[PDB]
Amino acid sequence: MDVLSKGSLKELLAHLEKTPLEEAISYRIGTVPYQNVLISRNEYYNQLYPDTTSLIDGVSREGQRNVNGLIMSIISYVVSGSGHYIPNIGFMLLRRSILDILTKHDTGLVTNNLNYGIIARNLTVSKMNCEQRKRMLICFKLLAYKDGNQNDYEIYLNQNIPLKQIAPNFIPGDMRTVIHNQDQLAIVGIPAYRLTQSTELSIRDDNAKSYKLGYVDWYNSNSFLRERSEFNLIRL
Amino acid sequence: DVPFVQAYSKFADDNPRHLRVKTGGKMANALTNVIRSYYSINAPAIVPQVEIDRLASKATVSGDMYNSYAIFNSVPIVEVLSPARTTVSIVGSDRADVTM
Amino acid sequence: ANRATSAFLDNPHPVGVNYVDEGSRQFVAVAELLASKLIDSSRESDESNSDVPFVQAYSKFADDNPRHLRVKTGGKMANALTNVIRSYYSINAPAIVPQVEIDRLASKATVSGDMYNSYAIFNSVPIVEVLSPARTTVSIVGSDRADVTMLNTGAGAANITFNFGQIAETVILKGSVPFQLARLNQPMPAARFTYKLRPLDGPFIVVLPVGNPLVISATAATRIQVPLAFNKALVESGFQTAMNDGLFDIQNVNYYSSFDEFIISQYHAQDGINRVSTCVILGLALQAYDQMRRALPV
Amino acid sequence: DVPFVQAYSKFADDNPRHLRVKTGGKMANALTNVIRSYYSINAPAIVPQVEIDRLASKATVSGDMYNSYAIFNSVPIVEVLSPARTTVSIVGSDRADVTM
Amino acid sequence: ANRATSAFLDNPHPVGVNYVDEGSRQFVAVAELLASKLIDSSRESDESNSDVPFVQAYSKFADDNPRHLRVKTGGKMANALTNVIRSYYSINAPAIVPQVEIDRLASKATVSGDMYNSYAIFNSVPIVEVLSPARTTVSIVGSDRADVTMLNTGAGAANITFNFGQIAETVILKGSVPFQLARLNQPMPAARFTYKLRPLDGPFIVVLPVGNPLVISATAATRIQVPLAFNKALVESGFQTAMNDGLFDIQNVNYYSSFDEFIISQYHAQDGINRVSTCVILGLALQAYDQMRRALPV
Amino acid sequence: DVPFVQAYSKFADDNPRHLRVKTGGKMANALTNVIRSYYSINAPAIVPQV
Amino acid sequence: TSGSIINHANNLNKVINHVFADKPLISETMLKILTIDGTTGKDGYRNWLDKLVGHNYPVYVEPVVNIMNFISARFVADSSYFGYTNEIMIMPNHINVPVDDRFGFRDSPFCTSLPRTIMGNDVRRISYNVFSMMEDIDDVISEGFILYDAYFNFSYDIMTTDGVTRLKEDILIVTDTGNDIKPIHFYIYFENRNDKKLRYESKMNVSYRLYIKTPACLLPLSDYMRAQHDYVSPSSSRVYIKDPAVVYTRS
Amino acid sequence: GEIIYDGGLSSKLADVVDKTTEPHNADGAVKDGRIAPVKLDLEKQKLDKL
Amino acid sequence: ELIKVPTIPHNLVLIQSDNGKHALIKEDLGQWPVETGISLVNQAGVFAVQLANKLGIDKPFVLDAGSNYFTDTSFIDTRKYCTDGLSPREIQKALNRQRAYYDRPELTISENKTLLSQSIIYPDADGNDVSIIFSGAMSHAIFTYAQSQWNKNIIKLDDYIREITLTVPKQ
C-alpha cells in the first residue's frame, strides 16, 4: 500500500531506502505462475472466467532462490504491492534495504550476468500499464548503472520502442536528475468523489482495485496500529 | 457561435481560435491513443493514469458496460468437413453462402 | 487477356448544372431543417391530444394553414424540392423553379448552406478492371461486397491483375482459401486469408493455382465531404422513394441500386470532383425529401 | 485574433465566424470576376460598377499604373529565315536556343 | 517500344520519420520566426552604428549574450536546427536532438505549428513515362522546363503516348512547329502551337510527321499545402546552403538540383502524401537555416 | 506628398518642384558614373573624391 | 414533472421582480393594456410572458444587439484583456520553466503558453473542484500542477524599481472544509542581472511560484508600430435634421 | 565585510487555518456564483415541531 | 438625438523602468470579476453594457476628430498631426531614455521627425477624414465595430423622404 502510493521518483527512492528486503518477499507458498485457470466472476457471467496467473498479480507465487528470483520479487513488490516466495534467503540479506540490493556492492550479491529481456518476459511487461512499466525501468537502470552495464540497458530500450518512449529521465549517480524529475508513478491514491465497490474481470485489475479501495481506510487507521508494534522494538 | 464555443471549451479545455486548428485538445489525443492500445497488445499504451482520471471527472456517467445488449449478425462457420470429390466454398460473413 | 469490370462503374451519366449556387444550397439545407421539424412535430402531436405542434410546423413549411378537406401536399416548398431533385440527376432535366422562389424559400431559416464541413464513409467497392490470362475465367458480382470468382484451367499458375482505382481509401480482400497477393515488382508473401491494401499503391497481382476455385471478397471505404446534417440512412430511403416516384425517369440516364452506388460511379468518371459536389447536394435534398414525404404521403 | 478579425472585416464586410469557410466576402467575388474579364473579350463583364466603386472606397490609393517600370525576359524571335539546305529549330521563351 | 522518363523522378529515397509531432513542428516555426528577426535586427544594426539591436536578437535566439572572442555559431538553437534538418532528409540519418531540448526551444515564442494553412505552386514537370514505337528517338532534358526532342526515321507517322503524373494540376505544351495532340480514342484536332492539359484526363497521343525533328517544351504547376510563412525564394537558397555545407551527405540517398524537384519526386512515390508532409517541414526548416546563416556565417 | 518630398530632398540635396526634371540630383549622377568605372578599366572615372 | 414546474415558477418570479425594479422595462402604455381586466401591472405582465414561451415570432436584430454580442464574444475569447484567465500553474522554485523574457522582468510570472511538458513529461492538470477536496495536497504540490476548470481573477502592479517579484498573499489556504486559492496580486519588478542580493533572495526566500499566460494587453516598446490604428470620421459638411417631418399642419 | 545577503521576508505557500471552519464555497481567486450550501437541521433526536 | 464624440478612447499607458532599459505599452480596460460554476456568456453580457458605457458607444454616435490636429513649423511639412491617442512625444522620451542606458546616441533629427509624424489626419476620396493614432487593439476593434453598426441607420434626407412619400396625405 505504501509503495504503490508513492507518486514521485524522490518518494519512491526514499521509501526503498527505509524498507528492508523482508517486506519485498513473502512467506506464503502461493501457486505456480503461468497457468491457464478459470476463476469465478459472478458479477458478470454465470460461466467461469479464463485468466492466466502471472508474477505481477499481487499474490505471492513460488520463485527460485537464484539472483533472478530475488530481483523479480523486488520488481513485483514495486509494481504489484506483493512479492514472491524465495525459500531461506538468510538474515544477512533480509536486513538490507531494497535500494542497497539494487544499487550497492556490499550486499554480497552478484547481480551481473542479468538479462533484462528474460526478466521482462517473466514479469509480463506486455500486461503492465504505464506506471508499472516506468517503475520496472527504474529498477533496471539502477541495476545496470551499479554493475557498469549502461550499454545493455540502452540495447534493451532500443529493441523495445514502446518502453523507450516512456523511459525515466534520471541518471542513477546524479542527484540533480532525481530532484527535477516530473514522473508520476502513483498506482493508488485518494480519489476525488469515490469508486464503486465492484469487482473486475482480470486478476490484476481486481487485485489493483482492492488496493485502491482499501487505501483510504489504510491512510486513516495505520499510524496507531503500526506504532503499537513499533514501540519497544529495534529496526532490522 | 456561442453554443459551439461552450462545447469546444469543455471538450478541449481551450477557446476556439480562427488562426489555430481545431484538433480537439488533449481529449482528442487521449481518445486516439486508447483506441490504438485496444486493438493490439503490441501498442504503446502511453497515456498516463493522471490524464485518464482528470478527463473522467468532466462529466458524471457510470462506466457500466453490461446494462444492455446488441445483436451482431455475423455467421461463424468453424469448419465444414467434406468427403473426397465434393468441393465446398464459404463466401461472406454477414451472409455466408456455402456452395457444394 | 480478358477484362472484367464492376457493373456500376460504366457510363456515369452527366449530372445537372443548375441550383449549385450559394442561394440554392441554402434552400436545400433549409428544406432539410424544416422537414426535420415536420417529422418531430408529427410525433409530438400524435403523442399528445393537441395538433398545435403539427399546425405550427406545417405552416412554416407550406406557408398555409392545414385544412381538413384539402390533402396535405406540402405547399410551394414541396413542389420546389421535387423539381430541384430532378434537375440534379440529369443535365437533360429542365430547370423549372425560378431563382426568385428559391431565394424566398431560403429566407425561412438561417442556415449556412456549406456542404463540405463534414465527411461520410461510403462502402461501394470500385473494381476498375481485372486483367486475366487466356485460360482463366473471372466474374465480379456485387457492389457493397464484391465477390471475384477466378478459375484457371491452365497447366501452371496464373497472375491476375487487380485495379481498384485511385479514389478508395482502403480495400480489404478476403478469400475462401489463403492466397498470394503482392504489388508490382515485389516478392510474393506467404498465403494469407486477409489483405489490406491502399488502392493508390498500384496494381495488385494475385497468384492463382490450378483447380480449387478461389473467390475473393472485397470491401472498400471512401471518404466524401458532406454537410454535418448528412444521414446515410435517411439518404438511402430518399433515393429509393424518389426512384419509385419517377423523379429520375428521363431519357439516356443510368440507374443505380443505392446512393452509395451512385456517388462512387460519378467520382471515378472524368471531371469527378466537380461531379460529387453536385451529388452531395442531391443527397441532402433526398434526405429532406424522405422526411417530408413520410410526414405527408401522397 | 483581434488583428485578424479587424483585417478580415475590412476586406469582406463581415465578421469572421467559426464553422464557416472564410471565403473572402463580396470583395473576393469581384476580384475573381474582373480577372476573368481581363483575360479575353469573350468573358462576360457581370460586376456592377456601383459594387466596384463601393469597394474602391475602403482604402485610399492613387491607382496610377504608369509611375514605374519592370523588365521582362521573354525573347521575341519574330522570324528566322533560312535557305533550303538548312534546318532551324527554336526552343524556349526565357532563353531561346536556336539550333541550325 | 522504348520508355523515357524524367531523371529526377527515378528512385526517390525514403525521408525521415522523426521530429514530425506537434512539439517539433512548433520548434521549426519558432526557429523561422526568430531567424527572421535576426536578419531584420542586423540590418537595423547596420543602419545605426550601435550593435544593441543585434545583441538583443542574438540573445533571444541563442540563450546567451554575443561575445567578441567567441565565433557566434548561433547557440543551442542553431545546433538543434542543423541536426533536425539532417534527420528529415533520410531515414538513415540519426536523431541526435533530445525531445526535452526541442520542447524548451519551442517555448521561446507563441506560434501555431500547423503546416496546412496555405499553399505553394511548384514548377517541376513530372514526365512519368513517354512510350515511343520503333524507329523513333525520344530524349528528355530539364526539370523546370522539359524539352522533349523526338525524331522518327520510319516512313509512316508514329504515335507517342505522354503520361504525366496524376498529381500535377495543369501542364502546358509548346512545340517548335504546330503539332497534333489528343487523348485516348478521341478525334485528333488541327495542328496548334500550344496545348493546355489536365494530367488527370489520361495519357496523351502526339503524331510525329516524318522528316523533321519535333521538340515539345512543357511547363507544369502543382499545388502543395504549406504554412503561411513559406517563401520559395528563401527555401531554395536554404537548400543550396544545406547541400553546400554537407548536411545531406548520407550513404544511399539521391541528390536533387532544386527543392522543387525534391518535393515533386517524393510526391510521385508510394505514400507520397505522407512524404510531402515531412518535406514541407524540411522546407520551413531550410528557410530558417538560410536566414540565420546569412546573419551568422561560419 | 510630404514623405516623398523629404526622401527626395535627402537623396538629391534639392527640393522637388513641379516644373523641373526631378532626375535625382548629384547622387544620381555619381551613381551612374561609378557604375561605368566598375565595369571596365577603360572608363574615365570622372567623379572626384571630395 | 414537479421539478420543472417549481423551477419555472421560481425563475419567472425572479425575472418579474428584477424587470419591475428601479425603472421598469415596460412602458406605461403596455401596462394600461394588460391591466384593463383589473389585474395589477406585475400580474398582467407575468401571464403574457408565460404565453410567449415557445414562440416562433421573428425579432429584428437591432444595432445595439450586435454591439453587445461583439463585446461578449471578445470577453470570452480574449480573457487576459479583462483580468481573468482559465488556468494557472503552481511550480516549485527549483524547477526551471520557460517564461516570457521580452519585458525584462525579474522572475517573470508570465509565459507565452503554459508548458505542455516539463523535463520531458506532461504537466499534471487538476480541476479546481478536485483540488479543493484533496487531502494529499502536500505531496501533489511538490511536483507541480496546472489548475483549470475555473475562472481566476488576477491583478498586477508593475514597479519601476528592482526587487523580488512576489505575490501579495500566500498561494493557497488549507482548511478542514476544503482548500482554496487566495486572491492573486503580482508585484513585478524590472531586472538588473548583476544584483547578487536580489538574485539570492529570489532563489532562497520564495519557495513556490505562480505562472499565468502572458496578458495580451502588454506590448513591448520596440513593437510600438503594432499600436497604429485607423479611425474614420464623417465629413464636417453634414447637417443632421432632428425633425424630418415633410408636411405642416393646415392650421 | 559588507553584507550582501542576510535573509529577508520569506513567502509561505500555505495558510493552514488551525480552527474548525463551517463548510463554504470558493472565494478569492475563484468566486463561486452558485448558492451557498444549505444548512439543514436534520437528524433531530427529541421530536420537535412534529 | 445623435451625439458627437470629439476624442478617441485610446486607453493606453506607458511604463518604463527608472534606469530606462525596459519599457512597455499597456492597455487598461479595467478589472471585471468572474464567478465560476455559472454560465460565462450571461456575465459577459452584463459587462458588455458597462464596457460600452466606458468607451462611450452605447448610444448612437458619430465621431468628429477631424479638427484635432496641428501643423508643424517646417515649410515643406504641410501635414496635419493628430492630437488624439498616445502622443509620439512620450514614445520619443521613452526611446531616448532607453538609448541613454545603453550609451547609444540619442534619436537623430531624421528619426525624430519620422516618429513625431506617425499620427496624422488625412482626407479620403469620399470627403471623410481618417485619423491614424496609437491605441489599443480591443479599444480599436470595439469602437470601429460600433461605428459601423450605427452608420447603417444614418441615411440621406432624400432617401428618407422617398420611404415616407406614400404615407403623406393631401390635406
Side-chain angles (χ1 to χ4, degrees), chain E residues 21-24 26 37 56 60 99-100 103-104 106-110, chain G residues 97-102 112-113 115-120 193 222 226:
Chain E
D21 59 334
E22 215 295 314
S24 309
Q26 291 197 10
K37 284 183 194 351
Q56 281 171 44
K60 179 135 202 51
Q99 183 74 30
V100 47
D103 169 75
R104 194 189 54 84
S107 90
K108 266 168 182 322
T110 180
Chain G
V97 300
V99 299
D100 215 25
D101 41 355
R102 314 179 290 161
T112 61
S113 34
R116 31 192 300 280
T117 81
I118 287 282
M119 299 282 167
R193 274 141 291 291
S222 57
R226 293 182 183 174

Side-chain angles (χ1 to χ4, degrees), chain H residues 25-37:
Chain H
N25 270 338
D27 191 314
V30 175
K31 292 232 314 285
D32 201 300
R34 285 130 75 232
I35 317 198

